[PDB]
Design a protein around this ligand. Structure first.
Ligand code: HEM
Ligand code: HEM
Ligand code: HEM
Ligand code: HEM
Ligand code: HEM
Ligand SMILES: [C-]#N
Ligand SMILES: [C-]#N
Ligand SMILES: [C-]#N
Ligand SMILES: [C-]#N
Ligand SMILES: [C-]#N
Lengths: 239, 239, 239, 238, 239
């Protein structure tokens, strides 16, 4: 519904990325006790609906040392805490090890108002209809030189960024999260696409621009997964 | 307590930040076992109420690989050691992996006397009336260049730091610990706020100042939690 | 098979490198249950032989903390994900610990068209006949300075790279995968050789060229293995 | 072993061995753990003719670390045999090592070139004090440091000492030369009753030119309390 | 054995350094079962004595997190692979965890022919008659600047290295392995000495030469052990 779209598009909303890998002694547990422990997670995510939005991603076989990622949107990070903690306490959750936990807040754009009108218009496009796209998460930390630049300078650099990314507006969906102070990175970037070679070419195009020289850290980890319904993912651990 | 406030405010007091993560095989234990274990911790903290102040924070679901933090204040770090050792020797304690241990001493300010009188007055404000705030801990190591600067130059740079922070005095409470020689960092910074976006905006404001650029290390980890009664944390492990 | 050869030579094909370590408790099992565990993996590979190419490498005793690598070629990474996910859920797979996971795409060369005719001709040679060669996989990330260079400047630097490599065209087979955006590196370099000292001499030759100073990261890990049929490797694990 | 001699003579190896206890140690019966603690104490006593072993409680002060030994020996072979026997005890078998650093004591390289007043002041080295705090800071110098001539390093080390003078009484020091034996150049060791004095000393040294030649400083910085072995071990027998 | 000596002195021979740490759960095994396990390792080594040389070092109590190291010389790394894999599969081997695996090849010297004649003559002495010496292994990675220097310049720098090392030619035995491309380092240096203070003084003398400023990585780990018959090492684990 619009409640979901609200959380996904409005400013001041927190996005949290939580990554998990299943331990080995999980498969030592009797079979039917694992199909049952999966039901618990199914119901818990249903309960927290409304309050928060939980989307699920299969990282297993695409990201090293990771099976599952949640992307969680919440108006108060306190609620995300409470869900994750209840999730980690489920019998399925107890056998998971964390591979990452990052938070950021959505904000109204800082630079877009200073771009040419034709660019502002093009930025209205953001991905397409895609069922079960690939998703990529790339955390980013800027160098001190970036923050020492004044706004006019950073505006020009971000215009160059945007100019380079323009050909990819339809085939790559984006969402930027402002992370500074909530963990060790400044930004969390998130993308969906059906065409990974397009995403690859997009990043290559951005590598040339001046602002991609101000990234003190880029990735670590770069997470790649496929977006799916949660039951399909947990189904794999009950087999 | 006036004793509690003296420890939270006086100079010469040691602050310790002790982070723990719970073992997986804690959950392989029967519920009743885990039940008795939580009550013993409360009693321990009360046994030490005379010597030290212990405050508890839920990190689970907010900081990666961390479930619980204590902030401990004491006039002798021997006392903190004895508490934490006794704590780690409780039935609950026996199952925690340590995820961080940092110490520092409160000092009367080094630079503030050299600021303008208006700035000195503004600094009398330190945060808000806040139950269950978010807490953030950021360890900082300065570069060699910082220490090579003379006092006059560092004063000017810290006035700039302070100037940028002034708008956040009401909504972000701060406490600075001098750490050099007690672990691998120079400072432990501690913050409480009800408004995470304000804290994020405060750090962004400070990224711009010239003192920022003198941080050889900033975070790693950046700890994010919710300040809460211990019982509330303990209860999650009893489920 | 020509289709196999198509996957190994055509552009737009994804190469995935998946590394695994066998658990200490795998050898606890009777060779009987391991013999059938091995047959299960065989079955899965055959089942997937219509969509993907899977090749296997023994890393045990040559690469630290790794026993097995797969190199998988697919037209879609989602096919690779499903294969690796299924493989990790087999009884053998359940007793492996995932290690590294890297992906890249094959591309028609960017620079070769700008090289001298003699060099283009020489580049028609790539390895030679040899059974069960050694294999080496080296992930590489370029510095920002590399991407800020224009195409002409990079072409000249890649000419120098190729010039240093010419004596190794026949003794070392090469395959380059374009990785940016799919994990934390820009390229995955893959080599086969019967003569490890020749490979060592190749890398040394390359160390002198200016391009090799633009490597922000090189290796970590440098994977070294012996290429061989899956059956042989797996029956070494069965005994 | 003559204890004062090991602690003060040149050519003596000092070893810093750090250990954390496995969690499954606590699943052992109390009686088994009592016995195990006697085995460790007896082992130290059996080796007390050959090496000096001093014990420090890191639990609650250093992250991921419960126990440190500082061992002095005339030959690292003796230290090796002691630590290996220790690690084979019932208790030792449940410990994870969290550090192992070695260095030799040496006659001073720079002090002969300092002023006579500084040479005299350096005769003072710390503090009659029971159960002090101890700090261990591993240090690696940058390449530039070794490229300097001896005259230049002498002047820089005089500046170091000048800044440290006020603390000679409240902070005991012992410097070990470690290059080639592990990944660091020096192991620094300090004892104090007054951690704020140690803090202030390190701050005073951060300003000197020499402290800008440290490629690596700490990692880990070990903080502990010096204690009779029996008192440290009794914690584990609960 | 002349064949032992050929492996240790001839060019083109591979040296492998394999470090192991005994898991704690070994010690839960009854003493008798561990006695039988030691026996099995002894016979495996004897079986391989025809093709490779295996020497053993006690790292326990001298190198952090490490109990045992093998130095293996082989004419093909394939042989070393098969030995180490069979060793890791023995019951004793299944309770070891790897703390390092590096390979390098022996080469005829690159710079020696460019030194003065008297220096070439001095380099004829390598080490002493010394039973159960200390052994030190230091992996080294050069910076890009080293490889950018021409051969004449590197020759002069290596002459200065050799000049500083001259006093130690009798007291410290040396063996250099060329590792580039086989793992993440360029060289493995290996030393034997009866007097650790002489080795310390040797490294100190070299820290002053221009070449030692080109070491991007030096150690990590620096391995220190005592050379001894394998039986004695293994005995300790039988207790
Ligand atoms: C269709 C593709 C993309 C488009 C249209 C796009 C556009 C933009 C725009 C307009 C901004 C400025 C936001 C503001 O004004 O506050 C921005 C910021 C940013 N973008 Fe992108 N971008 C794209 C792809 C990427 C990629 C692939 C990455 C990195 C993996 C990336 C990393 C960032 C970062 C880190 C910022 C924040 C920089 C800052 O505000 O200081 N973007 N992007
Ligand atoms: C409302 C928020 C803040 C205010 C009013 C404030 C103000 C100050 C002041 C006045 C000092 C000087 C203390 C002295 O004279 O000894 C100081 C020191 C310091 N502050 Fe802040 N600050 C704020 C937020 C922060 C934040 C967010 C950080 C970093 C995360 C931070 C990091 C530091 C550090 C590392 C020092 C010690 C620098 C030194 O003494 O060398 N402060 N701060
Ligand atoms: C006989 C051996 C080799 C030959 C003939 C060779 C040749 C080439 C050529 C022609 C290209 C340019 C491809 C293009 O135009 O798109 C290239 C790219 C590349 N090569 Fe090699 N190479 C060899 C060995 C190696 C080795 C040993 C490494 C590193 C370990 C390596 C690393 C790379 C990298 C990272 C690139 C991509 C650079 C870029 O396109 O920006 N090559 N190589
Ligand atoms: C009361 C406090 C201190 C005094 C009196 C003092 C004095 C000295 C002296 C005289 C030397 C030169 C030894 C020689 O001539 O060979 C020295 C060396 C050294 N000190 Fe200190 N020091 C003190 C504290 C510290 C501290 C707190 C540290 C760092 C944590 C430190 C680190 C070092 C290092 C790394 C060296 C060896 C440098 C070299 O010889 O290349 N010192 N100290
Ligand atoms: C008796 C002591 C030593 C002597 C006589 C000695 C002598 C030499 C000589 C003659 C070479 C050149 C080999 C060639 O021409 O290819 C060399 C190379 C090398 N030595 Fe030493 N060395 C000694 C000790 C050390 C030590 C203690 C280290 C490091 C801990 C070390 C590290 C190296 C390295 C990394 C190289 C290879 C440098 C290169 O070829 O780029 N050496 N040494
Ligand atoms: C940028 N998104
Ligand atoms: C400033 N705290
Ligand atoms: C080059 N491949
Ligand atoms: C100085 N010690
Ligand atoms: C030098 N070896």
């Amino acid at each position: 519904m619009a409640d979901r779209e609200k959380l996904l598009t409005e400013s001041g909303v927190y996005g949290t990325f939580a990554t998990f890998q299943m331990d080995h002694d999980w498969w030592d547990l009797p079979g039917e006790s694992r199909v049952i422990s999966v039901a618990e997670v199914k119901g818990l995510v249903e309960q927290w609906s409304g309050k928060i939005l939980v989307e699920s991603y299969l990282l297993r076989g695409l990201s090293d040392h990771a099976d599952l990622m949640f992307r969680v949107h919440a108006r108060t990070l306190s609620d995300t805490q409470q869900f994750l903690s209840a999730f980690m306490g489920t019998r399925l959750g107890r056998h998971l090890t964390s591979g990452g936990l990052l938070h950021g807040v959505s904000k109204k754009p800082t630079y877009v108002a200073g771009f040419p009108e034709s660019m502002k218009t093009e930025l209205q496009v953001n991905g397409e209809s895609g069922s079960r796209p690939y998703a990529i998460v790339i955390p980013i930390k800027k160098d001190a030189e970036w923050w020492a630049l004044d706004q006019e300078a950073r505006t020009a650099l971000m215009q160059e960024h945007t100019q380079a990314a323009l050909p990819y507006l339809k085939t790559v969906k984006r969402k930027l999260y402002h992370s500074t102070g909530l963990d060790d990175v400044d930004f969390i970037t998130y993308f969906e696409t059906e065409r990974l070679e397009d995403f690859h070419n997009l990043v290559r195009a951005l590598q040339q621009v001046k602002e991609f020289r101000h990234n003190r850290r880029f990735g670590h980890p770069t997470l790649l997964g496929t977006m799916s319904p949660l039951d399909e993912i947990l189904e794999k651990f009950a087999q």
